[PDB]
Amino acid sequence: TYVCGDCGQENTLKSGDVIQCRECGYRILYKKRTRRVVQYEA
């Protein structure tokens, strides 16, 4: 899963050539946080 910049739309394109977003001419992809259980210390 990779949310793109300048528009709210996930891509999930884990390919060796796909680097841009669908229906959007920009090529900046932010990795989306997956809801996993991590722990910290207070």
């Binding site: 910049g5 001419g25 920009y26 090529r27 900046i28």
Partner: protein, 52 residues
């Protein structure tokens, strides 16, 4: 600033030795920074140039 640069130069006549060449420059027109992508000419922002 660009007109004083492109207007203070004098192009010499291209004479190798009839048929000769003489080129000149006119008005200076600077466009806006765009993105030449595959879809169209998108808007180009200063953080797009910083991230890419």
């Amino acid at each position: 600033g660009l007109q004083n640069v492109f207007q203070s130069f004098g192009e010499m006549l291209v004479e190798p030795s009839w048929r000769y060449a003489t080129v000149k420059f006119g008005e200076v027109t600077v466009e806006k920074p765009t993105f030449f992508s595959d879809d169209k000419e998108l808007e180009f922002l200063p953080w797009h140039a910083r991230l890419q």
